Design a binder for this molecule. Structure first.
Ligand SMILES: O=C(O)c1cc2ccccc2o1
Length: 126
């Protein structure tokens, strides 16, 4: 069901949370080789999460589930904010700009924490 597809998508999201926090520790410790690998892992996880979210939104639309579509449109918009900040973080790492990397890292944490009540609302709505 779309609800079980959302729980699978939520688990991929939690995997990125786990990898992100390990990456933050590696960045603080200066282990740039680890950071590079974690950033590649995160890019793959976010790409997967995005695709799963789009399929869920499209299914909710085909089902006529207006409330779930509304929430998923809001949630996918916030997802793109996080993705843009993530991409900027990756660029800051490539460029060696640790100040910008720190900035974007905190921003990605706040954007993600803000979107959590909505994430839970969607599970109930589908
Ligand atoms: O739900 C997600 O795909 C997600 C959450 C998150 C938090 C920090 C960095 C990357 C992230 O991806």
């Amino acid at each position: 069901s779309v609800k079980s597809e959302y729980a699978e998508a939520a688990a991929v999201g939690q995997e990125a949370v786990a990898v992100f926090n390990t990456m933050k520790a590696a960045f603080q410790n200066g282990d740039k080789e680890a950071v590079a690998q974690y950033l590649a892992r995160l890019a793959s996880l976010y790409t997967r999460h995005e695709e799963l979210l789009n399929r869920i939104l499209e299914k909710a639309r085909r089902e006529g589930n207006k409330e779930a579509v509304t929430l998923m449109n809001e949630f996918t918009a916030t997802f793109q904010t996080g993705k843009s900040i993530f991409n900027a973080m990756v660029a800051a790492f490539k460029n060696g700009d640790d100040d910008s990397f720190e900035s974007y890292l905190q921003a990605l944490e706040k954007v993600t924490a803000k979107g959590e009540t909505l994430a839970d609302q969607i599970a109930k709505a589908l």
